[PDB]
Design a protein around this motif. Structure first.
Motif, PDB file in Angstrom:
ATOM      1  N   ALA C 212      94.113  44.295 -11.716  1.00 36.67           N
ATOM      2  CA  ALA C 212      92.810  44.904 -11.932  1.00 36.67           C
ATOM      3  C   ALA C 212      92.184  45.298 -10.607  1.00 36.67           C
ATOM      4  CB  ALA C 212      91.901  43.942 -12.693  1.00 36.67           C
ATOM      5  N   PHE C 213      92.204  44.386  -9.641  1.00 33.05           N
ATOM      6  CA  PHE C 213      91.607  44.690  -8.350  1.00 33.05           C
ATOM      7  C   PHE C 213      92.451  45.640  -7.515  1.00 33.05           C
ATOM      8  CE2 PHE C 213      88.421  41.424  -8.669  1.00 33.05           C
ATOM      9  CZ  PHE C 213      87.430  42.016  -7.968  1.00 33.05           C
ATOM     10  N   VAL C 214      93.764  45.678  -7.726  1.00 36.48           N
ATOM     11  CA  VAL C 214      94.578  46.638  -6.995  1.00 36.48           C
ATOM     12  C   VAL C 214      94.315  48.048  -7.494  1.00 36.48           C
ATOM     13  CG1 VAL C 214      96.919  47.434  -6.641  1.00 36.48           C
ATOM     14  CG2 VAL C 214      96.370  45.050  -6.283  1.00 36.48           C
ATOM     15  N   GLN C 215      94.266  48.229  -8.813  1.00 34.27           N
ATOM     16  CA  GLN C 215      94.181  49.561  -9.397  1.00 34.27           C
ATOM     17  C   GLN C 215      92.755  50.078  -9.506  1.00 34.27           C
ATOM     18  OE1 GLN C 215      97.056  50.501  -9.180  1.00 34.27           O
ATOM     19  NE2 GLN C 215      98.458  49.901 -10.821  1.00 34.27           N
ATOM     20  N   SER C 216      91.786  49.205  -9.780  1.00 40.24           N
ATOM     21  CA  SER C 216      90.426  49.678  -9.996  1.00 40.24           C
ATOM     22  C   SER C 216      89.851  50.326  -8.750  1.00 40.24           C
ATOM     23  CB  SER C 216      89.528  48.532 -10.439  1.00 40.24           C
ATOM     24  OG  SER C 216      89.012  47.848  -9.320  1.00 40.24           O
ATOM     25  N   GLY C 217      90.358  49.966  -7.579  1.00 41.73           N
ATOM     26  CA  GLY C 217      89.789  50.415  -6.332  1.00 41.73           C
ATOM     27  C   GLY C 217      88.733  49.496  -5.764  1.00 41.73           C
ATOM     28  N   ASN C 218      88.256  48.530  -6.545  1.00 43.18           N
ATOM     29  CA  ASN C 218      87.349  47.525  -6.032  1.00 43.18           C
ATOM     30  C   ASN C 218      87.999  46.777  -4.881  1.00 43.18           C
ATOM     31  OD1 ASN C 218      86.769  47.146  -9.377  1.00 43.18           O
ATOM     32  ND2 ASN C 218      85.085  47.632  -8.004  1.00 43.18           N
ATOM     33  N   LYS C 219      87.191  45.993  -4.188  1.00 47.71           N
ATOM     34  CA  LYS C 219      87.716  45.047  -3.228  1.00 47.71           C
ATOM     35  C   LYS C 219      87.058  43.702  -3.466  1.00 47.71           C
ATOM     36  CE  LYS C 219      88.766  48.389   0.312  1.00 47.71           C
ATOM     37  NZ  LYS C 219      90.009  48.727  -0.425  1.00 47.71           N
ATOM     38  N   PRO C 220      87.769  42.611  -3.206  1.00 42.47           N
ATOM     39  CA  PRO C 220      87.202  41.293  -3.504  1.00 42.47           C
ATOM     40  C   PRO C 220      85.922  40.986  -2.747  1.00 42.47           C
ATOM     41  CG  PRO C 220      89.296  41.152  -2.325  1.00 42.47           C
ATOM     42  CD  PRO C 220      89.178  42.532  -2.805  1.00 42.47           C
ATOM     43  N   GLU C 221      85.791  41.437  -1.494  1.00 44.28           N
ATOM     44  CA  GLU C 221      84.637  41.062  -0.682  1.00 44.28           C
ATOM     45  C   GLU C 221      83.339  41.406  -1.375  1.00 44.28           C
ATOM     46  OE1 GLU C 221      86.580  43.591   0.426  1.00 44.28           O
ATOM     47  OE2 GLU C 221      87.955  42.666   1.837  1.00 44.28           O
ATOM     48  N   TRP C 222      83.351  42.437  -2.208  1.00 48.12           N
ATOM     49  CA  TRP C 222      82.127  42.999  -2.741  1.00 48.12           C
ATOM     50  C   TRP C 222      81.517  42.062  -3.767  1.00 48.12           C
ATOM     51  CZ3 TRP C 222      84.329  48.580  -3.637  1.00 48.12           C
ATOM     52  CH2 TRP C 222      84.731  49.075  -2.401  1.00 48.12           C
ATOM     53  N   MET C 223      82.229  40.986  -4.109  1.00 46.67           N
ATOM     54  CA  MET C 223      81.611  39.936  -4.907  1.00 46.67           C
ATOM     55  C   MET C 223      80.406  39.342  -4.205  1.00 46.67           C
ATOM     56  SD  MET C 223      83.603  39.148  -7.685  1.00 46.67           S
ATOM     57  CE  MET C 223      85.208  39.635  -8.242  1.00 46.67           C
ATOM     58  N   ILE C 224      80.399  39.367  -2.878  1.00 41.29           N
ATOM     59  CA  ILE C 224      79.432  38.641  -2.069  1.00 41.29           C
ATOM     60  C   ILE C 224      78.431  39.634  -1.507  1.00 41.29           C
ATOM     61  CG2 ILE C 224      79.111  37.106  -0.163  1.00 41.29           C
ATOM     62  CD1 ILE C 224      80.505  35.862  -2.425  1.00 41.29           C
TER      63      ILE C 224
END
Lengths: 99, 79, 1351
Positions: C212-224
């Motif tokens: 999900a995070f690889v394909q969506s284009g999101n990045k994990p950091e943006w949780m914070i």
DNA sequence: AGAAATATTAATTTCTTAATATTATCCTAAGCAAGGTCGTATAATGTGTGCAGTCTGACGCGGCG
DNA sequence: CGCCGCGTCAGACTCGTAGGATTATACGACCTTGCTTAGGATAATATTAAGAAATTAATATTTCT
């Protein structure tokens, strides 16, 4: 009680008087289901946009009625993009994928 | 007609399509200003649209062909 | 302007800066004397725009001319004020903080991505313990918690070599530091190696999140969060109320905290505070942001000066009061009024009264335009003056503008689509709307204060819709069932019944009349009574072949009243329709016949005429109600005293000890019920016929003319029950616990109740009243859930070209034919060609609409099983087709393409429920009619007693006729004596099987000896030996009723011959050993050998209580939720031979081994289950092993789709049909279709191994991939059944899913998925104010489809 | 004489410039009340939400043997 | 394998609808700011010449009529 036009609420920009001319009739979810059942898409669309929230729509269509032209130029309800702002302020990027 | 639109429905074959065609024709008669094909008889343009569809005078193909005829004639009047 | 889809993702801090028009730097709102927005504050005019149209604050640039300029003195931009409502700000957080939605969700997304227990994250975030971001040293690993002193020690050994931090800085470093491809591939490779189920599902969660995070284009950091957006001020207003006080949206307060705390932090980092203070400040900053984003989810909710909790951001887009449910799906509406309603009995079906004042106020802009057009007011300003002055030309303009302008009347609650109908106004002098009586029933409107809302369709398409789709004269057939809903209700039906009745000897007895017209003349002249038997010539017409009405005249033997009424009846109908008493049923049926023979227009005119003549003649009667119209039976006192004496006698038999307390109760309640029924019979004999009338001088009793009897008999109001309470004794009441009070209310309303009798009555009164109050909310919730499941189902084709669907047969539950074929097939379309009893004789080229003509044709023949195309089996992908649905019940023809059937079905199922939620011996098979016999699901042998043995529990007895139409189905228990066999010509009134009502026996199928093994004394029984005849106190019971002593004692009895070795059931080698079931008594002790068919174990049953089955609304809700049914009837998962394994580890092992297949498959089954199967026996797939309710999931998984849909349809139907509510089956079928929407993949080569999928996507893939793209690299599926709420939440569109339930959870999932929805369902398009893809909007929306085709 | 066309004084717009006097920006200096921050040395060193009435039913799910 | 006990969250619908949460609170003294006086220099700006000439609207011939 009756109403053609009057007060409009502050945040949502939707019918709500009460002092003299009261707020309009609430057109709840069950009635939306009833119109979806009948298949009447245009009555629904005008009861969502130009009768309630669509600001440019509501005034433009009052003008159209007075002219004697019964036609609708509907946009997007205020409550929808108020929702867009409120979701965006939760740090969640919701947009509208334009053409 | 005024009370029941059964005849119009049998003439078009669909409640929804009938509404769309009748609204198009009533818009033609209310804003476009063109004259009705049936007598007025003191009716609102909506009901004249329904009455015309009852007699087979107005079908979606007929509206298309009249519009195309007038548009092509205007384009001819361009030259 | 037009967009196509809506995308959600995560807001990168750079993007939050991109939205913003300037940083908010201060907690200051407005000035306290000038009340003007302060610089940098929460309301600043530089950031969020100017306060007045085209004016800076300092008034330097103050007109339209200077638009677009930024006033250098104040920084404001000269622009519209509306941009206070669209511009956002941003607070630059002085320390990253965690987004609570992505941390405190039930499935934490930060905790899944990192794979760190939520407790450990909460410890790191609350500044409570460190964590290793990264360590070059090997002893310390990443994501390893280091407590404070442990950190100190670890620092002591190495120090710089390991990086350990505290708080959201640490968590952001962890999220930022992981690499998604690497963990993705590692998890994928190590999922297979050790594939434990719990571990497999956990790794599936992890993996799917990582792709999900690889394909969506999101990045994990943006949780914070490091930059926090700020809502535009108009959406959190601070506005002055009248009294000088202000009113502020709570967000301001919440926002203030953040900035305050943020500012403090910005200061502490400059003063180099002791890090304890900085830690506390960061804790409070995190807490304040959390309370902003979601106060509730935050462990302690911040409350304001009111002391009630503040409303956070998430609390505004969530709940019943949220934007979604309250301002976005259902809105307040202009051009709408409301008022009390009254009857307009002079109206026509398409007309509604409308007060002059209300219509003047609703149609006001129309009047303005018309007055300007006529020139009566060349000025809108003076037109308003004329309208307010109410000149007499305004009224003429109003009557001109209101003509042909339909207006929608609504009544809430709007339970079904016939609750909002478009009438055509008639202006009346008053203040109450006037409603046509015939249309009350659809509205459920009665005139005791009810109020109706009036809505004006403005545009021209809306006007044509309200005229062509909603007009009251189009809606005369219900959409749930096909029956009319223009039923003449209560006063009109009494008028018709009084006029079409008769008498022995009345004025004009037996004269001949020349037609109906002089029948009317004679009645009016006063020469003949309204109902007096007479011969009249009438000329009735009949539509023969080619639809031509042939006139045939005759001399009918009728009454005056029926002749008078024939004048209102349309041509095409027979006189038989009028030559009767004409109650409510007859009137509704004659309206049905008029509709079916003639059409809609004559039916509308006929309904109006019936209403007028019924009202007129009801008024001519003088029908009243006096206290003498309720006659107490003259023989009620003796019945009462007889029951008194009988209860005294049973008291004396209780004191004498002859009867027990529980037995005294049932006997005394029975004698009271018997006396009650005798009094009811006595009154109904003294009412219904007591009239003795003279005929030629001699008495001739006929049906009575009692006012109350007529009102009960015509069907107008009341029933025999209410009459019973009026004149007979009103029966037994119940205590507030359900316990029928021992003694009954022996008085009635004509004599009045006692004080205690009234007090007892009150318990039931309040029980029923509170039940009604609290029953509506449950029904509303059910309707809501159904609609949100079924929203986006619309007829989308004409013919999917499918193969056969469901197989349709009458439901015959024993004697009662619950529902016939004509009512189960009418309107549907045949699945394939249907043949007559003479084979290969066809009426249908595989599909024809079965209307009334074809139903009569197939009732000529004896066909009793038709294959019907059904919705559950449609091939159409994103919807259904026009054939697999059938008939549009309201319109009465094939269903139009583009109709919204999902909402129709949901409302048809949910509309009832609001109105009806909610001895026992079973001796033997008392066949009620003559016919043959056919046995099913039993494979037995002929016994030595001349009858047939009972091998299994599934003995289905099927009574047939001489016409081949099954009329009765029974289920005889395994081991119940059966007298006759198969193929016999059996007449009724006989018992074909034998067993006592308290006997559910199990029989030895051969001569049997008793061997004392495994019924071992001491461990399950106590030996009480009796004589040689074979008696004892031995009781054998099932596994659920076995003590703990008998672990190796298998409850059975080994059937052996006189030779000693196992004698065999005839036809087997496996030793005869009937493991006798529960509640069983066995008497034969060692030394006893009995006949081949003499019982061992009989199971007494009394079925006491008569209330042991759930029903009403919760049963239907449970059926649709598809919940687990407590203890389930276990099925046979695979056909094969079953044996036993390890004994009672807590559960026995059932090893199922096919003749040729997966032999080592086995199952574990508790010690509560009596197995209909034996120790080792060969069984087919999907067969009952243990008993109980069937879990529908298993029914779908093992039996076919048609099987589970039949199960659900039949169960919910039975629940409805029990209450006398009829709902055509198509509705339950379409909802069942929407349940069976997901599939779990079996194979691969196209997509993942098993993960959930939409079955339409899988079928499209197999229609693309397993076509000539590939031979078979496609993947098969297991069809999955899903509860309505789960299925409605497992929607592919996050706006529809977020609209109604778990808003927070759905939105969080959509954010971490980087989803988008393309606005295809009705709800999605209702929200964004577009045209729904149903009905009239269908033609529009397919244009957008075709334009999507060409870019 | 009763108009019916003509020549004269005579009452009168129309520009025009200059002019001529009035009047109204303007703008910066300065002043005064209001609003913001610092500074206080007897001694003083841990807590209030001041609770909360078991809703609620599945249900997720993290355990939990 | 089969529970099992922790939180946990939305529970259908239209009309109107009064009162609403205390505690206990220092003086200077700069320093700045945000608004008010004020004082002539010009600058518009409304009016006044003025005349001159130009109609132009009346006055008074005188010729028809």
């Amino acid at each position: 009680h009756a109403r053609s036009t009057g007060s409009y609420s502050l945040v949502t920009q939707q019918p709500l008087g009460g002092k003299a001319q009261f707020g309009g009739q609430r057109f709840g979810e069950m009635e939306v289901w009833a119109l979806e059942a009948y298949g009447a898409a245009y009555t629904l669309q005008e009861m969502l946009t130009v009768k309630s929230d669509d600001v440019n729509g509501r005034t433009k269509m009052y003008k159209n009625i007075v002219d004697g032209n019964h036609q609708m130029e509907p946009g997007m309800p205020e409550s929808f993009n108020v929702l867009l702002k409120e979701i965006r302020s939760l740090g969640i990027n919701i947009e509208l994928e334009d053409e | 007609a005024r009370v029941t639109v059964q005849d119009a429905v049998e003439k078009i074959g669909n409640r929804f399509d009938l509404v769309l065609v009748a609204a198009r024709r009533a818009r033609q008669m209310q804003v476009g200003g063109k004259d009705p094909l049936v007598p007025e008889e003191n009716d609102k343009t909506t009901v004249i649209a329904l009455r015309e569809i009852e007699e087979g005078l107005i079908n979606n193909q007929i509206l298309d062909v009249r519009e195309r005829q007038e548009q092509q004639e205007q384009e001819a009047a361009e030259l | 302007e037009e967009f196509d889809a809506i995308k959600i993702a995560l807001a990168s801090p750079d993007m939050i800066r991109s939205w913003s028009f300037g940083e908010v730097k201060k907690p200051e709102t407005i000035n306290y004397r000038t009340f003007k927005p302060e610089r940098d504050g929460l309301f600043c005019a530089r950031i969020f725009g100017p306060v007045k149209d085209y004016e800076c604050l300092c008034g330097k640039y103050k007109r339209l001319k200077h638009r677009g300029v930024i006033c250098e003195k104040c920084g404001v931009e000269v622009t519209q004020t509306k941009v206070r409502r669209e511009r956002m700000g941003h607070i630059e957080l002085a320390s990253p903080t965690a987004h609570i939605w992505f941390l405190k969700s039930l499935p934490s997304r930060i905790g899944l991505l990192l794979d760190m227990p939520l407790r450990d994250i909460e410890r790191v975030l609350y500044f409570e313990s460190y964590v290793v971001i990264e360590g070059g040293m090997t002893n310390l690993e990443r994501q390893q918690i280091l407590t404070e002193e442990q950190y100190l020690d670890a620092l002591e050994e190495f120090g710089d070599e390991f990086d350990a931090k505290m708080g959201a800085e640490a968590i952001q470093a962890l999220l930022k530091s992981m690499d998604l491809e690497q963990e993705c591939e590692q998890l994928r490779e190590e999922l297979n190696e050790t594939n434990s189920e719990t571990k497999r599902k956990k790794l599936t969660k992890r993996i799917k999140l990582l792709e999900a995070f690889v394909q969506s284009g999101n990045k994990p950091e943006w949780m914070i969060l490091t930059v926090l957006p700020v809502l535009p001020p108009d959406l959190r207003p601070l506005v002055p109320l009248d009294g000088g006080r202000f009113a502020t949206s709570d967000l301001n307060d919440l926002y203030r905290r953040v900035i305050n705390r943020n500012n403090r932090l910005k200061r502490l980092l400059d003063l180099a505070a002791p890090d304890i203070i900085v830690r506390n400040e960061k804790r409070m900053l995190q807490e304040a942001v959390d309370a902003l984003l979601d106060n509730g989810r935050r462990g302690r909710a911040i409350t304001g000066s009111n002391k009630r909790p503040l409303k956070s951001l998430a609390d505004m887009i969530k709940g019943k009061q949220g934007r979604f449910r309250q301002n976005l799906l259902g809105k307040r509406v202009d051009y709408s009024g409301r008022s009390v309603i009254t009857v307009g009995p002079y109206l026509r079906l398409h007309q509604c009264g409308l007060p002059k004042k209300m219509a003047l106020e609703l149609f006001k802009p129309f009047i303005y335009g018309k007055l300007e057009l006529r020139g009566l007011a060349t000025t809108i300003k003076a037109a308003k003056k004329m309208v307010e002055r109410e000149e007499a030309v305004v009224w003429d303009i109003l009557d001109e503008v209101i003509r042909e302008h339909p207006v929608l009347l609504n009544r809430a609650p709007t339970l079904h689509r016939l609750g909002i109908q478009a009438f055509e106004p008639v202006l009346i002098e008053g203040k109450a709307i006037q409603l046509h009586p015939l249309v009350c029933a659809a509205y459920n409107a009665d005139f005791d204060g009810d109020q109706m809302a009036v809505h004006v369709p403005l545009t021209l398409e809306a006007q044509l819709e309200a005229r062509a789709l909603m007009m009251s004269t189009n809606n005369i057939l219900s959409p749930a069932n096909g029956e009319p809903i223009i039923v003449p209700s209560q006063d009109v039906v009494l008028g018709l019944y009084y006029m079409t009745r008769d008498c022995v000897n009345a004025k004009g007895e037996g004269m001949v009349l020349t037609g109906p017209k002089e029948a009317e003349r004679l009645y009016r002249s006063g020469l003949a009574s309204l109902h007096a038997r007479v011969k009249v010539r009438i000329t009735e017409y009949e539509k023969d072949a080619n639809g031509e009405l042939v006139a045939k005249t005759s001399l009918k033997d009728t009454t005056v009243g029926r002749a008078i009424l024939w004048m209102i009846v349309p041509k095409g109908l027979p006189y038989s329709i009028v030559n009767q008493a004409l109650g409510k049923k007859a009137i509704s049926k004659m309206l049905n016949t008029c509709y079916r023979i003639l059409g809609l227009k004559p039916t509308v005119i006929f309904a109006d005429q019936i209403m007028y003549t019924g009202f007129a003649y009801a008024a001519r009667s003088g029908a009243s109600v006096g206290i003498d119209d309720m006659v107490i039976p003259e023989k009620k006192h003796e019945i009462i005293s007889e029951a008194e004496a009988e209860v005294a006698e049973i008291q004396e038999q209780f004191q004498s000890g002859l009867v027990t307390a529980g037995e005294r109760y049932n006997k005394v309640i029975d004698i009271w019920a018997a006396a009650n029924d005798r009094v009811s019979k006595a009154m109904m004999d003294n009412l219904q016929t007591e009239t003795v009338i003279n005929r030629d001088g001699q008495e001739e009793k006929q049906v009575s003319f009692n006012s109350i009897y007529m009102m009960a008999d015509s069907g107008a109001r009341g029933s025999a029950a209410q009459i019973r309470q009026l004149a007979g004794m009103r029966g037994l009441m119940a205590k507030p616990d359900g316990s029928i009070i021992e003694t009954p209310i022996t008085a009635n309303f004509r004599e009045g109740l006692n004080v205690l009798q009234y007090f007892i009555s009150t318990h039931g009164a309040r029980k029923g009243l509170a039940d009604t109050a609290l029953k509506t909310a449950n029904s509303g919730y059910l309707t809501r859930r159904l609609v949100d499941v079924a929203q986006d189902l619309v007829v989308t084709e004409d013919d999917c070209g499918t193969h056969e669907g469901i197989m349709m047969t009458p439901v015959i539950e024993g004697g009662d034919v619950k529902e016939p074929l004509r009512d189960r097939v009418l309107g549907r379309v045949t699945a394939e060609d249907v043949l007559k009893p003479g084979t290969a004789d066809i009426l249908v080229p595989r599909n024809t609409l079965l209307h009334e003509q074809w139903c009569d044709l197939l009732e000529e023949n004896s066909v009793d099983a038709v294959k019907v195309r059904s919705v559950v089996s449609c091939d159409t992908d994103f919807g259904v087709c026009a054939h697999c649905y059938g008939r549009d019940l309201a319109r009465g023809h094939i269903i139009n393409k583009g109709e919204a059937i999902g909402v129709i079905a949901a409302q048809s199922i949910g509309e009832p429920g609001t109105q009806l939620t909610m001895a026992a011996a079973e001796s033997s098979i008392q066949v009620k009619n003559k016919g043959s016999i056919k046995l099913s699901n039993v494979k037995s042998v002929v016994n030595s007693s001349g009858k047939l043995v009972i091998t299994s529990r599934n003995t289905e007895l099927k009574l047939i006729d001489e016409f081949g139409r099954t009329k009765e189905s029974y289920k005889v228990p395994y081991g119940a004596v059966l007298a006759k066999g198969d193929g016999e010509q059996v007449a009724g009134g006989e018992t074909v099987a034998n067993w006592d009502p308290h006997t559910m026996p199990v029989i030895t199928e051969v001569s049997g000896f008793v061997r004392f093994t495994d019924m071992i004394d001491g461990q399950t029984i106590t030996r009480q030996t009796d004589e040689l005849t074979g008696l004892s106190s031995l009781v054998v019971l099932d596994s659920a009723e076995r003590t703990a002593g008998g672990k190796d004692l298998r409850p059975a009895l080994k059937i052996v011959d006189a030779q000693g070795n196992d004698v065999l059931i005839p036809g087997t080698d496996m030793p005869a050993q009937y493991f006798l079931p529960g509640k069983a008594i066995v008497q034969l002790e060692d030394g006893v050998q009995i006949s081949s068919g003499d019982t061992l174990a009989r199971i007494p049953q009394e079925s006491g209580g008569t209330k042991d089955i759930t029903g009403g609304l919760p049963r239907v809700a449970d059926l649709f939720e598809a919940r687990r049914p407590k203890e389930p009837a276990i099925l046979a998962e695979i056909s094969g031979i079953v044996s036993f394994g390890k004994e009672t580890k807590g559960k026995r092992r059932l090893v199922i081994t096919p003749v040729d297949g997966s032999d080592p498959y086995e199952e574990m089954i508790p010690k509560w289950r009596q197995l209909n199967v034996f120790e080792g026996e060969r069984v087919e797939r999907g067969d009952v092993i243990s008993d109980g309710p069937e879990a529908p999931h298993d029914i779908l998984r093992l039996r076919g789709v048609h099987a589970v849909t039949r199960y659900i349809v039949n169960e919910v139907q039975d629940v409805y049909r029990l209450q006398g509510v009829k709902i055509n089956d198509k509705h339950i079928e379409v909802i069942v279709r929407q349940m069976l929407r997901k599939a779990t993949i079996v194979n691969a080569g196209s997509s993942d191994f098993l993960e959930g999928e939409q079955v339409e996507y899988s079928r499209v893939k197999i229609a693309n991939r397993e076509l000539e793209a590939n031979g078979k690299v496609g993947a098969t599926y297991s069809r999955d059944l899903l509860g309505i709420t789960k299925a409605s939440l497992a929607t592919e569109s996050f706006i529809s899913a977020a609209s109604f339930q778990e808003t927070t959870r759905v939105l969080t999932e959509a954010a971490v998925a980087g989803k988008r929805d393309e606005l295809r369902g009705l709800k999605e398009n209702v929200i964004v104010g577009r045209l729904i893809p149903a009905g009239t909007g269908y033609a529009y929306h397919q244009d957008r489809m075709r334009r999507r085709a060409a870019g």
